[PDB]
Each structure stands twice: as C-alpha cells, then as structure tokens.
Write a protein that binds this ligand. Structure first.
Ligand SMILES: COc1cc(C(=O)N2CCC(N3CCN(C)CC3)CC2)ccc1Nc1ncc2c(n1)N(C)c1ccccc1C(=O)N2C
Length: 260
C-alpha cells in the first residue's frame, strides 16, 4: 500500500541532518514544488539500521495522526524514504535557546500534542512502543499557540540503544523487549524537559553503574520546580514511577493536561 517514486520525481535541496537511523535531506516534489524530506541509510553488521529502515516504514505506513510524522513514498536505488519535513526543528535544540523562552501557552500546547500522539500510538492493537522518545525525536511544526499542530512524534525504527539512559524507564535498562509503559516514563521526562528547559537528570553526576542503580533501586528522579502546577506535577510523578503498573493511561494524561 505504499507508493514508489522515481529519482526523477524529487529534487534535493540541502541536507538537514540525521534522524533516527538515517540522514535527512530537504527536497521538493517536482510536480508540486512542495517540500519533502528524504531519508537514506548512511553506510559491519551495524548496518542493521536497514531493519530500522524497514521497521520505520512499516509503522509509519499504517499510522495517520496529526501529531505523528508521515510517510509519502519510497525510492529504490538507493533505498530511500520521502516523508514530511517538519519546518521548525526539533525540541532538543529549541530548548537550547535560553534567551528566548517558550511561552506557557505554547509549552502546554507541546505537551498536549505529544500526549495526543502517544495516546494514539497506544490505542493500536497491538500498541506501538516507540522506545526512543526523548527531545531530539519530537519535531516542531509551529511554535504558535493557535496552530492546529505544534508538535509531531518521530523516529519509528523501534530501537533504543541527548540519548543515553536519562530517558529510559527502569525495567528497560539492560533489557530487550519494553512494554508501552516505558513510553509513559519517557513522556514524563519529556514533560519535565519542556517545563524546565533543562535536560533530565542533569542535576546529578554519578558513574554509569551508580546511576542506573540510583534510578532502578533508589528512585532518583529529577526535581520538579516549586512553581509547577500541582496538576502537572502530579501527572509527571505518576508517569515516572518505578512500578510500570502505576503509570497512567493516556486518556488520563491528556484530560489532565487539558485542564491546565
Ligand atoms: C526544517 O527542517 C528541520 C531543521 C532542523 C534543524 O534546524 N536542526 C536539526 C539538526 C541540525 N544540525 C546540522 C548542523 N549543525 C551545526 C549541527 C546539527 C541543527 C538544527 C531540525 C529538524 C527539521 N525538520 C525535520 N523534519 C523531518 C525529519 C527531521 N527533521 N529529522 C532531522 C528527524 C530528526 C529526528 C528524528 C526523525 C527525523 C525525521 O525522520 N524527519 C523526517
């Protein structure tokens, strides 16, 4: 069910950078001069990004949400994906401009959008576990509060490997197949980052072994600010609990966020 396009159908422009497993470029459809994005594999059995390639394609193909990144077609020599280029960037970089803070109305917009996207992912039979949810993977479409969509979820090769474990739910570390509650834990981290603008767990320096243990065994988490809404705090705290069971359904998270 997914179109194939030929090289004569798209025009390359400039290279955006690496997303997920590949290299993203900015391009346009020749028929329409509409902008598009092309994802390709970049060159010892690590070239197992190929599965990530296929995995991303399969998953993107069957999904359709405003808050989820879309796929348009495929290209073949070399194998490539033509997908949407989100215009405004990624969340990680945006949070790096401290001089210019994101507006609360907007931060709220971003949080909801992500939840709506993730809520949708988990309503699938079977559910979709992203597994690589962190700020670099949240793409921004508009930073305007009145826009239909502000944030979109991305990077669907479902692998794990700012990316090391600050973002990972505890059962997940040093494990392979990662329920959907892992994502809930990650989402909490994302909520924490949008709110604070500071990366998760950056207030601590522990060696790797100690750090895992602190998170797994002791319960260490980031410190939420005193001036954080109780409604929001409560939500974050739940999603990031040690017991995966205590983590909420996205129905709850979304509703609560809406009241904020
Ligand atoms: C207008 O297009 C975008 C621009 C930017 C952007 O401004 N960046 C990102 C990387 C960039 N680097 C280049 C040089 N710099 C000195 C170091 C880092 C810095 C600033 C970021 C994202 C953009 N849009 C975009 N749309 C769809 C994506 C995707 N991104 N990427 C890169 C992905 C990123 C993560 C996960 C998935 C994707 C992806 O699949 N797509 C299709």
């Amino acid at each position: 069910r997914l179109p194939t396009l030929a090289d004569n159908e798209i025009e390359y422009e400039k290279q955006i950078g690496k997303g997920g497993f590949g290299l993203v470029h900015k391009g346009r459809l020749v028929k329409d001069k509409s902008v598009v994005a092309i994802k390709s594999l970049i060159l010892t059995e690590m070239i197992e990004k190929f599965q990530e390639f296929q995995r991303e394609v399969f998953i993107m193909s069957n999904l359709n949400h405003p808050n989820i990144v879309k796929l348009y077609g495929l290209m073949h020599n070399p194998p490539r994906m033509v997908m949407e280029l989100v215009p405004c960037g990624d969340l990680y970089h945006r949070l790096l401009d401290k001089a210019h803070p994101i507006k609360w109305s907007v931060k709220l917009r971003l949080m909801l959008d992500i939840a709506l996207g993730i809520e949708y992912m988990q309503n699938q039979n079977p559910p979709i576990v992203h597994r690589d949810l962190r700020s670099p993977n949240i793409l921004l479409q508009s930073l305007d509060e009145n826009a239909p969509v502000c944030a979109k979820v991305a990077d669907f090769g479902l692998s794990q490997q700012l990316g090391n474990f600050q973002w990972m739910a505890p059962e997940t570390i040093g494990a392979e197949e990662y329920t959907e509650k892992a994502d809930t834990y990650s989402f909490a981290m994302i909520l924490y980052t949008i709110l604070t603008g500071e990366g998760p767990f950056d207030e601590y320096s522990y060696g790797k072994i100690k750090f895992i243990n602190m998170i797994r065994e002791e319960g260490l988490r980031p410190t939420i600010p005193e001036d954080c809404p109780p409604r929001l705090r409560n939500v974050i705290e739940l999603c990031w609990s040690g017991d995966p069971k205590k983590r909420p359904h996205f129905s709850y998270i979304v509703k609560e966020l809406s009241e904020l």
